[PDB]
Design a binder for these strands. Structure first.
Lengths: 282, 282, 282, 282
DNA sequence: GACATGAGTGCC
DNA sequence: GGCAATCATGTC
DNA sequence: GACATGAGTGCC
DNA sequence: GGCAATCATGTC
């Protein structure tokens, strides 16, 4: 129905693949040719379906009737999720060899900063697959089911999770601390204390984010990267990243990563997805 | 040349007139058949042209090339400015009598919360046409002029204002306290403390806003109304509103306005634009 | 055994009466010729007896064996409770007529500032008689009994009250907020945040005290007066004072009392103890 | 004139030696048989003279005419300075072997926490003799000369040091952060933030102190020991202490020191004044 | 991974 | 020796 | 209009 | 009494 453009190349299989690994049952549905999920903009709700068109370098977006009133916001959330803004020539030109194997690579965003904030926290310690499980369990117990599309459920809203009983969330498979970290976030979301869009000083904002309980530096970075689509953040505390920089302390990795400014976020994605990558034999 | 929907009726004449009066020279061009303004989204920028199609309840948005990479957000920004989501048959069904004269009334949003915040501040105590002229100076001094369209210039950014010399701001025609309010506001925008989108608890967010130097309740209320497009806020401290409710205290005005919950903002605009309106003998 | 002197005149009759009215059962005992109470200084506990000898205008102080190791402090405490440093000639000479009906008048101090802090809060609203009874129940429930004097019980320490159950204190016949105020006051004392001795800037010190939940301007003033024996503070919010200055508002009473600087605390006691008194209608 | 008791044994030779090496010229005088210093309690000033009587197990105190109105507090001040409360049988029964060589060891206190605070900071990273001269300058540059004893000057008051040129102090012989440490300490003293008497939670109180500029864990430890006469603190970060535990780290020392609870303050003193001391090689 | 403890360094 | 910036431990 | 004072009122 | 909400009032 609605259509947006993007600049080639765009590695849709890599992206869909990435979203598929982390998809949340009842919330999203990922296939090799499309992506679809529940979505709530204020009191408006429905199902969004994104269908890429390679030959045309266009993305077709359909919205169920309930979302039509806020169509444009839905589109903007979709464009942030898929990084339609990216100019591969600029980024690939800057990274050189690091991104030559997958020039279509994009930064997987999100459709809602609050949701991404919840996703990032439950992503702590556990595995990608396991986090998706847990999130799926939190969506289950706290999300609203779409009247018009029963199969789908909306990601839990801030007001709902802010009222949740720490004990209940704990019961789902997380320490009490983690559950408290979630409740605190929902409240910050309600008060306007959790930046919902990228802030002017990502560094300062991430720092402030770290005063939140349950949110350490890994969570704040990963959150800025996904929740804000911050393009210049590396994840030196990341598990897989420690594996890509054998025997290197976080500050070492951070300093090494500096050579990729101002597209560090993109370099991170490349390192993550380069099987045998290893620092330069220098 | 994208297109967005709107439900009828929609009083474009009234909407353009509202924006026209507050149009900031070099930023916005307001004619009776179209709206156009410079627009900056991150590093992306250009000019936006909005053309209403009464013919079939549609809004045609044109984007210059420099904004195409972020077309989606641009459209979202416009939908918030023109209140495209509004279902007038629902609002007027609630306001009844009060909105029967101008059923096509809409809430004039903004295209950026920070900009709107700056406008709210520079709108304090002075006349409408005055705030406009004054704001245009600020835009002229701290704005980034477009290369694609030289005639236009982008609204100041938070980093540019956060770094402004207070006195230099004062010299433009405002007290120092106001020049300082702007600077604080920009900082808050820089570190993610100024909610850029409507928060879950508008009351709470407004309370917090009032702790900002230069921001009192009238400014908070007004900011929430236009900056977040909050639909249920009234301005009992407004100059004109006080005239509409002869000899009533803010609390009394607010008690009275409760009859229009949950659409107090619409009620507010109708009362603002209804010369000679007076309260019932309730 | 121990002896401390004073400068005449001293209205022991009044001093003992005042104290007798506010005496806490099991804690203090007030006769017409002597005063006595339980007393703890660190881990040193015992009973103190003070017998004033008008004839030789000296104060007889006897100490149970348990306090002998910290005798001097016990002495300094009795001297603050009885204001033996007072030079009646300097005060009665700076007050004129106000201090004539009883020039022996002394500022009734306290034996421990935390204790006085508790007494100040429990003294809120209720009569002097009820405050006493209420304070008696707090002592009985959290107090420390002296192994050598089972009739006597030590006033609750911060360690016990800081750990107290809000509902337990409430059950003694006080609002939940008052109980919460006590618990907080205790924590401050544990943390070292409650001035246990008169601070250089009583004004600033009191202002800070008012940020304590449950402590308003009245409690702070009365606390400064009794707990720090600050000699220049008035109680313009005091109920009885309000009646001594009919028609006047807090600040007017406060503007009037400035005439008695820097001995406003004494003036307060005098105006307090003169049923007739009334201001001079300027 | 006034007499205070103490329990044997009491190493007066050592005590006076400790105070003599830290004696501030113009403030205090120390001799083989007595101690004497300026003393200010409110607007009352004068000279205090302490003379020990070994025959009677007593300390004789003499006050100059200007301190008589507050004699008892003066006495209490001397008692805290000379640790008259100490029961050597208890401390030695606990320290065992460690204090067997000088069972008359006492904890040298102070006559005022603020002063002690100032001395703690002025003694940072310098020799006892230098801190003495340095403090001496500070005393003369901001003190209160006694009219009845011209060569004696009262230690600077918090108000006087609060309102002091941060450069003038530097001039006397200290860094910039050094003088700012004083000025801050003074303000804290003016508003009642610096505990003047031992708090119920020494650990927590010290933690807060470390948030004071210029006041680190060492000063906070040494301040608790001398200014509050806390009896169970230790100084693992002390230069001399480190050498008494060759190699060991602040945490290891700290842990070995626990064997002396609840009298670590005493253990410390014995270790400071026992040269060839070294822990059990075990 | 978040978080408090503790321990290098290393500079005014 | 106050004080900012890392690492390495060790529960939750 | 923001923003300190200061009062009233009403409900803990 | 504490305290939040509310209503002038004077200043910038």
């Amino acid at each position: 129905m609605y259509t947006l453009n993007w600049q080639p190349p765009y590695d849709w299989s890599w992206m869909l693949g990435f979203l598929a690994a982390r998809a949340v049952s009842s919330v999203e549905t990922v296939a090799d040719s499309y992506y679809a999920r529940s979505l709530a903009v204020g009191e408006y709700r429905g199902v969004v379906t994104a269908i890429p068109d390679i030959a045309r370098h266009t993305l077709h977006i359909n919205l169920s009737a309930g979302l039509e009133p806020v169509a444009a916001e839905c589109l903007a959330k979709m464009s942030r999720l898929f990084d339609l803004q990216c100019n591969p020539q600029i980024v690939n030109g800057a990274l050189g060899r690091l991104g030559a194997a997958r020039p279509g690579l994009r930064l997987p965003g999100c459709v809602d900063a609050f949701e991404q904030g919840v996703r990032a926290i439950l992503g702590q310690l556990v595995s990608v697959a396991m986090a998706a499980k847990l999130t799926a369990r939190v969506a289950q117990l706290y999300g609203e089911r779409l009247d018009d599309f029963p199969e789908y459920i909306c990601f839990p809203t801030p007001q709902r999770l802010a009222a949740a009983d720490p004990q209940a969330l704990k019961a789902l498979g997380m320490p009490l601390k983690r559950a408290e970290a979630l409740i605190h976030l929902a409240n910050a979301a309600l008060e306007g204390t959790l930046p919902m869009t990228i802030p002017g000083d990502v560094e300062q904002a991430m720092k402030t984010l770290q005063t939140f309980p349950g949110i350490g530096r890994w969570t704040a970075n990963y959150f800025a990267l996904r929740g804000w689509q911050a393009k210049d953040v590396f994840l030196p505390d990341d598990y897989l990243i420690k594996q890509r920089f054998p025997g290197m302390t976080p500050a070492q990795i951070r300093r090494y990563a500096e050579r990729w400014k101002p597209w560090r976020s993109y370099a991170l994605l490349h390192i993550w997805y380069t099987e045998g990558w290893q620092p330069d034999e220098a």
